[PDB]
Amino acid sequence: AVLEQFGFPLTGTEARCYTNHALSYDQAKRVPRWVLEHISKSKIMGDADRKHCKFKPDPNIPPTFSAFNEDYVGSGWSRGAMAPAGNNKFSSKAMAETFYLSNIVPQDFDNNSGYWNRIEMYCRELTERFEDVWVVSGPLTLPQTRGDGKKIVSYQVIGEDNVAVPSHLYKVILARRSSVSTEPLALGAFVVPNEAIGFQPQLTEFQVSLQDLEKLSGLVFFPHLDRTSDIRNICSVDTCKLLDFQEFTLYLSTRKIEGARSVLRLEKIMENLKNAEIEPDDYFMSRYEKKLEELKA
Amino acid sequence: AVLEQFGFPLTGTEARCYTNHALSYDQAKRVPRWVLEHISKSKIMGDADRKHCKFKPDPNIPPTFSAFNEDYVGSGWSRGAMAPAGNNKFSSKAMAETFYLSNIVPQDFDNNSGYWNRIEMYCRELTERFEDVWVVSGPLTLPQTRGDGKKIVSYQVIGEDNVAVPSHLYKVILARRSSVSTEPLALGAFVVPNEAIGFQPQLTEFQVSLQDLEKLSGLVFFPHLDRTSDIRNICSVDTCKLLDFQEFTLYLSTRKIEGARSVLRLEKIMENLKNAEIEPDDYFMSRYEKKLEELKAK
DNA sequence: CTGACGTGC
DNA sequence: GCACGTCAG
DNA sequence: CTGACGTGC
DNA sequence: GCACGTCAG
Ligand SMILES: [Mn+2]
Ligand SMILES: [Mn+2]
């Protein structure tokens, strides 16, 4: 009728498809509401290198509602990708699209480089055991209850564009053994506080029911999912075991080997590795000698 | 590809149409993001009465994401309609739908019955001078700059369902003189804090540019409105003048005549006027003597 | 006009 | 616990 | 792997 | 001020 003569207000929440992920953008907060990615063992292999990528505004987002690097730099918060670059080694285009700020939230540096990175590495590990893995990640601004029962949502906004800093990050993991497998699906929802987290807390300490997360986020995840199909807790069908300090430090050092462009850096890697722990079994020396061998050329 | 194998997440932000308004619901905050209404002379006349209406959850909203009266009662916040009941005198069906909690936000009681009430009455007043008036209303949670330069958004959530309490309320007013007139349209955008305001601040003190409001709300208002055509500031073409204390009080006293159930309550309405040294006009006096004659036969 | 609150089925 | 009469800004 | 930071034109 | 080498979790 005449009510829509000049159109309904636009919220800009429609799904946006990229090479290897999709997202819904929150124009008021300058961050994604959710970012959906599909992981398989083929996608996490390849020569795509993030050194040739740089954060930038998503051109498909109206500049009025876009975040800009000026909002993050100097803010005290790191640019935290929801769809990580590590899941897009198969395509330079796919990886570069993860560096769109439409995929980024203000994230604690330690959290970004530590616990959240470890969760991301677990999702990649799942592809060694499940043919297909679906992951939805996004930010949350949860309330905190005072001693008198009053509940308050408090979160910082940074930059000229007031980019919302989430209090928590969520991750919903859906895994299917194989296309023909009559085995149940594995499902897990996790909510992590946007702060430094050590190596003591297991991932199950941050596990929540999907229903609780849907009430906290206002989102319905995987709506096409058959509610009577056998779905099991991913931490019962699998391990939900993140890497401990020793494995984590070794994996970082191994990745640093493959990128060592000089021999002097190769020595620094070993010095950092060896102190204050770690003798590499089964595997860091085999790749250390190989890179040392080639670099002599 | 297999990316959408089980469907994309659902935000539930699609426009929902009712008899005389439309809204987009915020499932995470349990309040509407925006509520659009169209006002005309005909729509604000009629016999529809609030006494036949009750606040209830919107049946079209998934209960998982719905607010409930239990969230509001005893919270210290009033239920504040975005599309007001006063704009739906023409239809009891349309008025009942404004009491769906999908149209409601937690609102300061004084602001709700005072300053915001007066802005709504100005929107109805505009139909005396414009054939058609469109109004978009909704909540805002704006940041506050702290002493250390940090910018913090901070708002309360109330009830078992964590209904978000907005820090501000916005209203965008679009007015067209006539369907055939070549006169530019009149546009105004306003942001009012969710607190008691009083009669000192003029409405223009709360005016903002449409682009500022869109930047703050993350919404694009009236996307089919030709913004490159000449559009006039409504406070320049019109008055943007809310009722002052005397007019407001006299208008409330007039409405209260109709609802007085006793001769003692009707006379107190006249007493509070004269005790405030407000002079009753003729329509009030005539309406007052009519009701008084009819109440002394109880 | 805008609302909440106490009473009684 | 709602429906409804009462009371306030 | 995840990132920021210091330096140079 | 960005581009890029260097550095840190
Ligand atoms: Mn990250
Ligand atoms: Mn109201």
Residue A14 lies in a domain: yes
> For residue A137, which of A103, A172, A110 has the smallest C-alpha distance?
A172
From chain A, pick out residues whose CB is under 8 angstroms from the CB of B153. 141, 153-157, 164
Q: How many CA atoms lie within 13 A of A240 on its CB side?
A: 21
Q: Which residue is nearest to nucleotide F3 (CA to C1')?
A: A54
Residue B289 lies in a domain: no
Residue A20 lies in a domain: yes
- CATH code, domain with B148: 3.40.570.10
Residue B214 lies in a domain: yes
**Residue where the block lists tokens 């994604």:** A32
Nearest residue, CB atoms, A152 vs list B64, B150, B154: B154
Q: For residue A50, with 0-12 CB atoms within 10 Å meaning exposed, 13-18 middle and 19 or more buried, which class applies?
A: middle
Ligand lying nearest the CA atom of residue B137: 2
Residue B68 lies in a domain: yes
> For residue B218, which of A44, A9, A195, A204 has the smallest C-alpha distance?
A9
Residue range(s) defining the domain that contains residue B74: 15-247
C-alpha distances in Å from residue A17, one per residue of A13, A56, B107: 12, 17, 38
> For residue B14, which of B31, B29, B30, B26 has the smallest C-alpha distance?
B26
Task: Enter the tokens of residue B143.
Answer: 């940041």
| B44, B89 contact by CB (below 8 A) | yes
* Residue of A8, A155, A165 to mutate, interface with B, max B Cβ within 10 Å: A8
**Residue where the block lists tokens 């992981």:** A39
Distance CA B255, CA B269 (A): 10
CA–centroid distance, residue A140 to ligand 2 (Å): 30
CB contact under 8 A, B8 and A36: yes
CA–centroid distance, residue A115 to ligand 1 (Å): 10
Strand partners, A171: A137, A190
Task: Enter the tokens of residue B182.
Answer: 């070549």
**Alpha helices (H) in chain A, listed in sequence order:** 69-72, 92-98, 109-113, 115-125, 210-217, 234-237, 245-258, 263-274, 284-296
In sequence order, what E strands does chain A have?
Answer: 16-17, 21-26, 31-39, 78-81, 104-107, 132-140, 143-145, 151-158, 163-164, 168-176, 185-193, 207-208, 231-233
C-alpha distances in Å from residue B99, one per residue of A138, B92, B204: 33, 11, 29
CA distance A220 to chain B (A): 5
Number of independent structural domains in chain A:
1
Residue of B nearest to A132 (CA): B2
Ligand lying nearest the CA atom of residue B35: 2
CB contact under 8 A, B222 and A36: no
Residue B258 lies in a domain: no
Give the closest nucleotide to B262 (alpha carbon vs C1'): D6
Residue A270 lies in a domain: no
| A57, A66 contact by CB (below 8 A) | yes
* Residue of A2, A3, A61, A231 to mutate, interface with B, max B Cβ within 10 Å: A3
CA→C1' distance for A49 and E5 (Å): 20
Residue A56 lies in a domain: yes
| B37, B87 contact by CB (below 8 A) | yes
CA→C1' distance for B114 and D9 (Å): 7
| A214, A198 contact by CB (below 8 A) | no
From chain A, pick out residues whose CB is under 8 angstroms from the CB of B127. none
